């Protein structure tokens, strides 16, 4: 608590001193304690680890106590403090090895929630520290896995934001993408609704950014390496099937239709091979409403997209 109040006082001093000329004219600047700790963390490379636990605990406390709770003058120290906390945590992630397994675990455990609390800063930190993808894979490649296994339960916004934040690690890996593919495939076939609502949201991100995806149990079985170079036609058939699943996913509530309609443009743009099937999906869906004849004056069907069940009218 003493360290926390000290850094808050220092940032208040900086925000007061930058705000005037007279006070800036009288005094000479002193090294404010933000750069002091930001230099201590860098200096901690020299083979002593008895400060890392205190450093990470300070980073997490200082981030939690001054997060943006918007769900004006005092916000600026309350934002610079959070920025300092993120900088400190990311800095201790790279230098010291023994502690990097727990930092990511805490960030994940704090970000994967149904509470809908504002978690923008934690998400930014997670995206920053998964930039070094192999470094995570060396030490802690398990916490991400059971984070993926829990991805079916969360609501729509948080899964989309979390997957978008974690996709830099997805870009450069092969085991992780197959694990996510398996999790999403199991989530699609699960009869529990709102699971498909997140499965399609995962699939659109997984498909609109990667040209080639996918690969190349009992105790008594062991995985072995098979040295077959990848077959391009097999991967194209894999993509075509994973898109046909989405084609028949177009008999759901309006939100799945919304996000599918919004993602198909980027899917067409980034994976040019699927061009001649996405349009055969869209054109074959539209003709359920557009009514082709010489002349029938309301050319689009007005009521064909509305539903009447239980006298709770909503659009599909």
Partner 1 sequence: GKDLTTKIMQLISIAPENLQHDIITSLPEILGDSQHADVGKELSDLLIENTSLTVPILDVLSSLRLDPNFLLKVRQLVMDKLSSIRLEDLPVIIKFILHSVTAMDTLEVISELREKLDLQHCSSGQSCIILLFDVIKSAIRYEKTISEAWIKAIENTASVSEHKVFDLVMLFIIYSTNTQTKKYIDRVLRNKIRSGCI
Residue numbers at the binding site for partner 1 (CB under 8 A): 64, 109-110, 112-116, 150, 191-193, 309-310
3-state DSSP call for residue 315? Answer: strand
Task: Give the pairing type, strands 314-315 and 306-307.
Answer: antiparallel
Our CB check for partner 1 shows the closer of 13 and 102 to be 102
State the CB neighbour count (10 A cutoff) for residue 314: 10
Q: Give the separation between CA 103 and CA 88, rounded to whole angstroms.
A: 11
Place of tokens 């705000």: 19
Q: Give the separation between CA 308 and CA 175, rounded to whole angstroms.
A: 46
Residue 176 backbone dihedrals phi, psi, to 5 degrees: -65, -40
Q: How far is the CB of 309 from partner 1 (least distance, A)?
A: 7
CB-based contacts of 162: which residues, under 8 Å, 6+ apart?
111, 112, 123, 151, 154
Q: How far is the CB of 110 from partner 1 (least distance, A)?
A: 7
Our CB check for partner 1 shows the closer of 112 and 129 to be 112
Our CB check for partner 1 shows the closer of 92 and 173 to be 92
Q: How far is the CB of 95 from partner 1 (least distance, A)?
A: 23
Q: How far is the CB of 279 from partner 1 (least distance, A)?
A: 29
Our CB check for partner 1 shows the closer of 2 and 297 to be 2
Discontinuities after residues in the chain (C–N over 2.5 A): 71, 216
Beta bridge partners of 315: 306
Our CB check for partner 1 shows the closer of 189 and 290 to be 189
SS (H, E, C) 281-314: HHHHHHCCCECCCCCCCCCECCCCCEECCCCCCE
Our CB check for partner 1 shows the closer of 109 and 232 to be 109
């Amino acid at each position: 608590d003493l360290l926390k109040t000290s850094v808050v006082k220092s940032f208040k001093d900086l925000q007061l001193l930058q705000g005037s000329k007279f006070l800036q004219n009288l005094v000479p600047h002193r090294s404010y304690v933000s750069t002091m700790i930001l230099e201590v963390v860098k200096n901690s490379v020299h083979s002593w680890d008895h400060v890392t636990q205190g450093l990470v605990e300070l980073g997490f406390i200082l981030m939690d106590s001054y997060g943006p709770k918007k769900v004006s003058l005092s916000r600026m120290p309350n934002q610079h403090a959070c920025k300092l906390g993120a900088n400190i945590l990311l800095e201790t992630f790279k230098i010291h090895e023994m502690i990097r397994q727990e930092i990511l675990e805490q960030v994940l455990n704090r970000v994967v929630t149904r509470a809908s609390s504002p978690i923008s800063h934690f998400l930014d930190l997670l995206s920053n520290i998964v930039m070094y993808a192999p470094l995570v894979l060396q030490s802690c490649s398990s916490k991400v896995t059971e984070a993926f296994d829990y991805l079916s339960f969360l609501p729509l916004q948080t899964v989309q934001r979390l997957l978008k934040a974690v996709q830099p690690l997805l870009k450069v890996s092969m085991s992780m993408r197959d694990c996510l593919i398996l999790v999403l495939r199991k989530a699609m076939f699960a009869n529990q609704l709102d699971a498909r609502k997140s499965a399609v949201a995962g699939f659109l991100l997984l498909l609109k950014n990667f040209k080639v995806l996918g690969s190349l149990l009992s105790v008594s079985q062991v995985h072995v390496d098979v040295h077959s170079h990848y077959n391009s036609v097999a991967n194209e058939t894999f993509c075509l099937e994973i898109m046909d699943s989405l084609r028949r996913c177009l008999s759901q509530q309006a939100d799945v239709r919304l996000m599918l309609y919004e993602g198909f443009y980027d899917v067409l743009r980034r994976n040019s091979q699927l061009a001649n099937s996405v349009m055969q999906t869209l054109l074959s869906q539209l003709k359920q409403f557009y009514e082709p004849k010489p002349d029938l004056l309301p050319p689009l069907k007005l009521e064909a997209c509305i539903l009447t069940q239980g006298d709770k009218i909503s659009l599909q």
